[PDB]
Amino acid sequence: FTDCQLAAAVCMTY
Amino acid sequence: GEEEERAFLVAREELASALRRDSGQAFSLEQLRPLLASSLPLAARYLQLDAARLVRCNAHGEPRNYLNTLSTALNILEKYGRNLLSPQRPRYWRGVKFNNPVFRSTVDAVQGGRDVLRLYGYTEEQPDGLSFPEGQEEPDEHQVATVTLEVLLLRTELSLLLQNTHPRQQALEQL
Ligand SMILES: *CC(=O)Nc1ccc(NC(=O)C*)cc1
Ligand SMILES: [N]
């Protein structure tokens, strides 16, 4: 994945 | 013996304080040299993370592959700790749900990835994931900063092993 897919996904699990 | 350990713990506390000062700070390989070029064993250098278990229990297949799956999990786990130290935390930071494709492919793809979230403060086992206890209203900055630094340091150590430029590569390769 890209670094922005990871950050956006982090906010998705909240 | 205890002097090399003392110098490590002092440098660990110094770098963890800078994380609290700025949660988006990027550390150079020079700033991490006191933490990278250390002869101390893993148990003396990783006080919160279980580096040996996270690496050996996930060492299955080729090192090119599982060291990378570990790095991606450590990368996304670092962002979890950095958001907790941010001056403007995310809205629902208190809980983390697991039914996400990226989460399944990163954190839930390595053994012990969920347990790193416990070190941040997500100790309440919920149906869909983990959450902070009902008592705490804000995360412990010192605990989050030290765990985020250890997650950052381990990802750095694994990245140098993949580049074959680790200062103690031969010792770490023998897990
Ligand atoms: C490229 C990049 O930095 N992207 C990015 C996307 C999302 C977020 N944050 C959230 O979704 C909360 C940060 C960075
Ligand atoms: N969430």
Numbering used by the authors:
A (entry chain C): 4 to 17
B (entry chain A): 3 to 177
From the paper:
To target disease-causing proteins that are inaccessible to small-molecule or antibody therapies, we are exploring the use of a nature-inspired drug modality that exploits the intrinsically favorable properties of synthetically constrained α-helical polypeptides (Helicons). Here, we report a rapid, high-throughput screening platform utilizing phage display that enables an unbiased mapping of the α-helical interactome of a given protein without any prior knowledge of its structure or known binding partners. Biochemical and structural experiments demonstrate diverse functional impacts by the Helicons which bind these sites, including inhibition of protein–protein interactions, inhibition of enzymatic activity, induced conformational rearrangement, and induced dimerization.
Most hits for the RNF31 PUB domain could be grouped into two families of related clusters (C41 to C43 and C44 to C45), both of which competed with the natural binding partner Otulin, and both of which appeared to contain a critical tyrosine residue – also found in Otulin – but that had otherwise dissimilar logos. Upon solving X-ray cocrystal structures of member from a representative cluster of each family, we found that two Helicons, FP06649 from Cluster C44 and FP06652 from C41, bound the same site at the protein surface, but that they engaged this site using completely different binding modes, with the critical tyrosine residues oriented differently. This observation was our first structural evidence of the ability of Helicons to identify distinct binding solutions to a common site, which we have since observed for several other target proteins.
